[PDB]
Design a protein around this nucleic acid. Structure first.
Length: 49
DNA sequence: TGCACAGGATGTATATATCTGACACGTGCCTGGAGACTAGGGAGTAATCCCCTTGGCGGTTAAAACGCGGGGGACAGCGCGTACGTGCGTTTAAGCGGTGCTA
């Protein structure tokens, strides 16, 4: 979805596409490579009312 | 007899003045600004060709890092002996201003 990715694809810089492919493969192989699953926790309000 | 003071003597901190330096105001000349001529170095313009990262990636290696033993280097104490510090008396010539020459 990321527009910059689309732009990169449009560029046709063979290196850039190779890198994109590498990132895709990384994402498929195990998500931790692309982004560690964030450890979910409550939202914190700055100060009570 | 010895003291009080009437009459007189050197002195001097106080006070009035004379003996030296520095800054501002007056002359007057080698100027600083200005006018105009000047051109060629600076700056605006245009390639052009070459050198600098791409970008992370694995498979390696050479250098870096970390761990350990220990032994000897650094270093705080201190016994003591003397050679620099403080204080004379004493001498020299360094400082002061002066007179006459000159290079």
């Amino acid at each position: 979805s990321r527009a910059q990715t689309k732009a990169t694809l449009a560029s046709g810089n063979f290196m850039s596409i190779v890198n994109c492919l590498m990132q895709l493969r990384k994402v498929c192989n195990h998500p931790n490579l692309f982004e560690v699953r964030p450890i979910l926790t409550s939202f914190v309000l700055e100060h009570c009312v």
